[PDB]
Amino acid sequence: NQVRPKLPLLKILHAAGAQGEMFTVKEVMHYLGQYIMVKQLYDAAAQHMVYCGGDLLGELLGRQSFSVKDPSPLYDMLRKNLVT
């Protein structure tokens, strides 16, 4: 089954190379991960920390950094930005 990202998350996925408007959740997670990797946002020495600053992802989350080990805020953003 596919989900439809809402516009602010869709821009992020497109920035990471996603094409189109409909994706499986695994595909959403792949492209959102790709955004973080290709923009080198994770800390190379503490790779669960993501420093997004004021980029699209930091604006969407309302935070300049987050930890993949504490994913509640990510899951909140994903809930609000994926139409199942």
């Binding site: 990797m37 790779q47 669960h48 994903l78």
Partner: peptide
């Protein structure tokens, strides 16, 4: 542990 390995553990 790499970013990719941490990221793969997410399960929204």
């Amino acid at each position: 542990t790499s970013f990719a390995e941490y990221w793969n553990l997410l399960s929204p």
